[PDB]
Amino acid sequence: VSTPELKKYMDKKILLNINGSRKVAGILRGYDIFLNVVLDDAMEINNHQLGLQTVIRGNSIISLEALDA
Amino acid sequence: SQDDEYVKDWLYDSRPLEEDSKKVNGTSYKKWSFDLPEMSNLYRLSTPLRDEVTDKNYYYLFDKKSF
């Protein structure tokens, strides 16, 4: 029920740490209570993009870092 | 013995409550602690002499200070 306050990070690029040392860059589109990140896809770790619009699952999230201030 | 049902028995006594060990301190007759309805009875009875002015504002420019 406690909504993770990502409205500070809405419509901003974020370095999402995810399972197995994998990174995801991309501007934020939305989210849910499980922290599932709906985001515009960008280059995945030299570097290369997979997809246009992505939805990452919360369970697979290690972290999400403020790329943009 | 209906409206004045509680006090009637003891209202006219030398010491209002010589015993009544719950309601007063004792026979030294130092302190008291009535229940509600008897207090109500007392209040009703006191209608002639009772202060009879709840609106504390009323004493405006008539307090001791004002005097």
């Binding site: - | 609106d55 504002n57 009323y58 004493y59 405006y60 420019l61």
Partner: protein, 89 residues
């Protein structure tokens, strides 16, 4: 002006059932009735001055207060030449 001891008077009259208030944040000024610049103007020294005499009284009295007027008898008026165009011709 008229407001003075208003709260108190109200309280007295109302038997303490009239907790009244006054305040001034609107800055709602208004003309004092009666017209400034009159010779005779009013009647009283002690009594409150009439409605149509009031403004003049306020002015002259305030001048006295502020020390502008000379003595008891005086007048607020124009300091210009041509006899004030002979007092508006």
């Amino acid at each position: 002006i008229e407001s003075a001891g208003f709260e108190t008077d109200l309280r007295l009259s109302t038997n303490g059932l009239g907790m009244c208030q006054l305040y001034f944040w609107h800055k709602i000024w208004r003309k004092v009735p009666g017209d400034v610049l009159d010779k005779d103007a009013f009647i009283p020294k002690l009594k409150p001055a009439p409605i149509n005499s009031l403004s003049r009284d306020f002015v002259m009295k305030t001048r006295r207060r502020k020390g502008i007027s000379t003595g008891g008898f005086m007048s607020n008026d124009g300091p210009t030449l041509e006899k004030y165009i002979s007092a508006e011709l």
